[PDB]
Design an enzyme around this catalytic site. Structure first.
Site, short mmCIF file in Angstrom:
data_model
loop_
_atom_site.label_atom_id
_atom_site.label_comp_id
_atom_site.label_asym_id
_atom_site.label_seq_id
_atom_site.Cartn_x
_atom_site.Cartn_y
_atom_site.Cartn_z
N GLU A 91 28.37 66.68 81.59
CA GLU A 91 29.70 66.84 81.02
C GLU A 91 30.25 68.18 81.46
OE1 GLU A 91 32.49 67.28 77.12
OE2 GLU A 91 30.60 68.36 77.33
N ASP A 106 25.41 67.87 77.78
CA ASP A 106 26.60 68.42 77.16
C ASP A 106 26.95 69.80 77.71
OD1 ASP A 106 28.55 68.27 74.88
OD2 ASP A 106 27.60 70.13 74.33
O1 LIG Z 1 38.68 67.69 77.89
C1 LIG Z 1 38.65 67.86 76.47
C2 LIG Z 1 37.22 67.98 75.95
O2 LIG Z 1 36.52 68.90 76.82
C3 LIG Z 1 36.89 70.10 76.13
O3 LIG Z 1 37.59 71.07 76.90
C4 LIG Z 1 37.10 71.37 78.17
O4 LIG Z 1 37.86 70.70 79.21
C5 LIG Z 1 39.26 70.87 79.09
C6 LIG Z 1 39.75 70.15 80.30
O5 LIG Z 1 39.28 68.78 80.26
C7 LIG Z 1 39.65 72.36 79.08
O6 LIG Z 1 41.06 72.55 78.88
C8 LIG Z 1 38.92 73.08 77.94
O7 LIG Z 1 39.22 74.49 77.96
C9 LIG Z 1 37.40 72.85 78.05
O8 LIG Z 1 36.79 73.33 76.84
C10 LIG Z 1 35.75 70.41 75.14
O9 LIG Z 1 34.47 70.34 75.76
C11 LIG Z 1 35.93 69.28 74.14
O10 LIG Z 1 36.03 69.80 72.82
C12 LIG Z 1 37.27 68.58 74.52
O11 LIG Z 1 37.71 67.63 73.54
#
Ligand SMILES: OC[C@H]1O[C@H](O[C@H]2O[C@H](CO)[C@@H](O)[C@H](O)[C@H]2O)[C@H](O)[C@@H](O)[C@@H]1O
Ligand SMILES: OC[C@H]1O[C@H](O[C@H]2O[C@H](CO)[C@@H](O)[C@H](O)[C@H]2O)[C@H](O)[C@@H](O)[C@@H]1O
Ligand SMILES: OC[C@H]1O[C@H](O[C@H]2O[C@H](CO)[C@@H](O)[C@H](O)[C@H]2O)[C@H](O)[C@@H](O)[C@@H]1O
Ligand SMILES: OC[C@H]1O[C@H](O[C@H]2O[C@H](CO)[C@@H](O)[C@H](O)[C@H]2O)[C@H](O)[C@@H](O)[C@@H]1O
Ligand SMILES: OC[C@H]1O[C@H](O[C@H]2O[C@H](CO)[C@@H](O)[C@H](O)[C@H]2O)[C@H](O)[C@@H](O)[C@@H]1O
Ligand SMILES: OC[C@H]1O[C@H](O[C@H]2O[C@H](CO)[C@@H](O)[C@H](O)[C@H]2O)[C@H](O)[C@@H](O)[C@@H]1O
Ligand SMILES: OC[C@H]1O[C@H](O[C@H]2O[C@H](CO)[C@@H](O)[C@H](O)[C@H]2O)[C@H](O)[C@@H](O)[C@@H]1O
Ligand SMILES: OC[C@H]1O[C@H](O)[C@H](O)[C@@H](O)[C@@H]1O
Ligand SMILES: OC[C@H]1O[C@H](O)[C@H](O)[C@@H](O)[C@@H]1O
Ligand SMILES: [Mg+2]
Length: 580
Positions: free
Chosen positions: A295, A262
């Site tokens: 991830e 993660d």
């Molecule tokens: O992608 C959504 C999940 O990953 C989150 O967000 C990360 O990746 C995004 C791009 O895919 C970015 O915009 C964001 O700033 C990153 O944090 C996060 O790990 C999960 O909560 C999201 O649902």
């Protein structure tokens, strides 16, 4: 010539001794003045070895209950292998050598052969346990998935949760079952020829139950922070070993086939050898065929080519697909146009952002790196996962979002499951499950109230702390028997069978994959020595005949699969076909 830093002789926690001699208790503390172990209610002073290491051997065996006593304060063991009374209670001594494994003829699974199926143990069955999950394994085998991806099992506080508030990383969460129940689940999966992968969280500890700082504040640093507390200090070897020893336990002692790490961008480490590299060294020292996935949102190939991880969950595909089907633009969805042309590009490139400006407000930067080094299996693709369902206010699935038809949902499945990239499905996706997957938790007291308030403010929204929010996320297995749920399931079975059987879809080389579009029709072509396949997906609102799609090659003539079971090479709105 990499040598593990781990030796069972010096293992922190409580480790059974050979010859029935009992248990060796060990801990590291940088600050305690008096140090004892309390075993089955009786306190015994521990021996100081230097370096803050304390040790004692007693004739107690597996099943004994203990915690440590630091300056007179009873404190749970961060290295606990089981916490039957939860994260504030006594640990149990566990012996990994007594379980009767039957999986000697299982030798792991290669990433290129993985079709992941993401399970949350608590909601996957009514019982919400490993034993009940194990009874669904024949269903999963027949479905055609090959690797179960289990959400985090480290013990956290409360009676339900996703797993990301895990605090005692070595202790499987007691409401799901005892250690041997987990071993039985893995053993059963291996018997059926299914791999089992575990989601582990090495970027933060949850807010309740993490007593590491009681032993040594220097496990953590104020240089930076987690969502819940002080950051994990990977300049501190004991912190490094906490997570590498944990990875080794899951793989060696529970027979997991791999780990999904993660939030790897938040495993901050400026050491000469990065903790990700050392994790890979430490798990590879075990001498099996274990996989490590990240991830990671940075679109950074170095995770594979420098840190020697096996692959990366890469969300650009998911996001491009969702925007195509809904038009939504909130948050990170503003990074994507969607549509056939856009999807053809993202697939061509593996991920979209290879260094270009990411213009999402609040997040602006030059995002990503060239994807050239990565091969198809190194990208893990999905159209649903725990986050992309559960981080929505109402936790709704793709077919439950406004404006998405079941025909579009079924077309998206055909795209996902015919690509050479490594696919993942979320539990119940395969039958267009009627139930949401909402964010739920069960923290105590003020923390619990803060979670409820935090969720309200972030976005009525289902209260994460309410029992109903957990129950509403339970899978309804009987619904798959009927109606559109059964139709969708029939399609998933057919797609997975073809992925398995079709000699051209066995392709795992980006060299052999091309994409393009004609208007709102996406095409994906695979050419190998075994022949040619083309997947066409009509993302428009109208009907399109395959014969009128403009292509830079002659379209194959044989209909191998139509997502709505049609006889002719015509695509209604949202529909797809595979030809060869
Ligand atoms: O992608 C959504 C999940 O990953 C989150 O967000 C990360 O990746 C995004 C791009 O895919 C970015 O915009 C964001 O700033 C990153 O944090 C996060 O790990 C999960 O909560 C999201 O649902
Ligand atoms: O390592 C286990 C086996 O993996 C492959 O077979 C599995 O994965 C295939 C591709 O997804 C599936 O089609 C198949 O049903 C699975 O059993 C590999 O082909 C086998 O030789 C391995 O033993
Ligand atoms: O022993 C005091 C508490 O220690 C932990 O809580 C600290 O660390 C958490 C992060 O893992 C933070 O969220 C929290 O604010 C800190 O106080 C432990 O998790 C608690 O149960 C203890 O009461
Ligand atoms: O800063 C991270 C790395 O960036 C480069 O590596 C990425 O981009 C390269 C081309 O610009 C690709 O060849 C490579 O596969 C990507 O990972 C840089 O070459 C690396 O040394 C950096 O660690
Ligand atoms: O209808 C106004 C919007 O049109 C475009 O968005 C649509 O078309 C995209 C493909 O070009 C789809 O992916 C998307 O789902 C549609 O909503 C345009 O990109 C938007 O900015 C407009 O608001
Ligand atoms: O099993 C891994 C590879 O399977 C396919 O390639 C095999 O079968 C091909 C027939 O078209 C041969 O060309 C090739 O020599 C065989 O390895 C698949 O096309 C490959 O991408 C996989 O690496
Ligand atoms: O640079 C403009 C576009 O070029 C490509 O798209 C063209 O070529 C494809 C393959 O022959 C066709 O599928 C497509 O209809 C053509 O417009 C490229 O694939 C696109 O991303 C570019 O926008
Ligand atoms: O952003 C990419 C960089 O992130 C981190 O600093 C890593 O330590 C480094 O290996 C990588 O190149
Ligand atoms: O605004 C700062 C931004 O820079 C970054 O490198 C991250 O990719 C992004 O998540 C962050 O928000
Ligand atoms: Mg046209």
């Amino acid at each position: 010539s990499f040598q593990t830093q781990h030796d069972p002789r010096t293992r922190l926690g409580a480790t059974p001794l050979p010859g029935g001699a009992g248990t060796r208790f060990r801990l590291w503390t940088s600050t305690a003045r008096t140090v004892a172990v309390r075993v089955n209610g009786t306190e015994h002073v521990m021996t100081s070895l230097g370096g803050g290491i304390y040790e004692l051997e007693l004739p107690v065996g597996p099943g004994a209950r203990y915690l440590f006593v630091l300056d007179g304060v009873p404190t749970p063991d961060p290295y606990a292998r089981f916490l039957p009374d939860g994260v504030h209670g006594e640990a149990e001594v566990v012996d990994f050598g007594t379980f009767d494994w039957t999986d000697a003829d299982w030798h792991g699974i290669k990433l290129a052969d993985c079709v992941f199926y993401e399970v949350h143990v608590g909601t996957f069955t009514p019982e919400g346990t490993y034993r009940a999950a194990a009874e669904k394994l024949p269903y999963l085998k027949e479905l055609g998935v090959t690797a179960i991806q289990v959400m985090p099992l480290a013990a956290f506080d409360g009676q339900r949760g996703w797993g990301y508030d895990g605090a005692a990383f070595y202790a499987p969460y007691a409401p799901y079952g005892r250690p041997e129940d987990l071993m039985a689940l893995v053993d059963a999966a291996h018997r059926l020829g299914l791999g089992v992968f575990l989601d582990v969280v090495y970027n933060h500890f949850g807010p309740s139950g993490n007593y590491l700082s009681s032993y040594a504040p220097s496990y953590f640093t104020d240089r930076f922070s987690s969502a819940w507390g002080m950051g994990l200090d990977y300049a501190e070897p004991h912190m490094r070993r906490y997570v590498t020893g944990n990875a080794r336990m899951w793989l060696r002692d529970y027979h997991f086939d791999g780990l999904r790490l993660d939030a790897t961008p938040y495993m901050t480490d400026d050491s000469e050898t990065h903790i990700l590299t050392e994790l890979a060294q430490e798990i590879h020292e075990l001498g099996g065929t274990h996989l490590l996935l990240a991830e990671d949102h940075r679109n950074l190939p170095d995770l594979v080519t420098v840190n020697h991880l096996d692959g990366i969950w890469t969300d650009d595909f998911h996001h491009e697909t969702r925007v195509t089907l809904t038009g939504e633009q909130e948050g990170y969805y503003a990074g994507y146009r969607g549509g056939a042309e856009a999807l053809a590009y993202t697939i061509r490139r593996g991920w979209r952002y290879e260094g270009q400006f990411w213009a999402v407000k609040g997040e602006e930067h030059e995002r990503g790196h060239p994807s050239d080094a990565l091969e198809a299996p190194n990208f893990v693709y999905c159209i649903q996962n725990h986050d992309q369902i559960g981080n929505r206010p109402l936790g709704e699935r793709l077919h439950q979002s406004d404006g998405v038809t079941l025909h579009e949902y079924r077309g998206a499945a055909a795209l996902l499951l015919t690509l050479p990239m490594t696919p993942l499905l979320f539990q119940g996706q395969e039958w267009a499950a009627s139930t949401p997957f909402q964010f739920f938790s069960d923290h105590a007291g003020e923390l619990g109230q803060a979670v409820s308030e935090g969720r309200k403010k972030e976005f009525d929204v289902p209260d994460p702390q309410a029992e109903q929010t957990f129950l509403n996320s339970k899978l309804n297995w009987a619904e798959r028997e009927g109606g559109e749920h059964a139709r969708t399931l029939r399609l998933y079975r057919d797609l997975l069978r073809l992925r398995r059987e079709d000699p051209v879809l066995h392709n795992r080389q980006r060299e052999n994959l091309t994409t393009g579009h004609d208007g709102d029709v996406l095409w994906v072509r695979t050419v190998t020595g075994a022949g040619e396949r083309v997947l066409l997906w009509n993302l428009g609102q109208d009907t399109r005949a395959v014969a009128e799609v403009k292509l830079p090659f002659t379209v194959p003539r044989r209909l191998l699969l139509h997502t709505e079971g049609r006889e002719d090479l015509t695509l209604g709105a949202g529909e797809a076909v595979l030809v060869g």
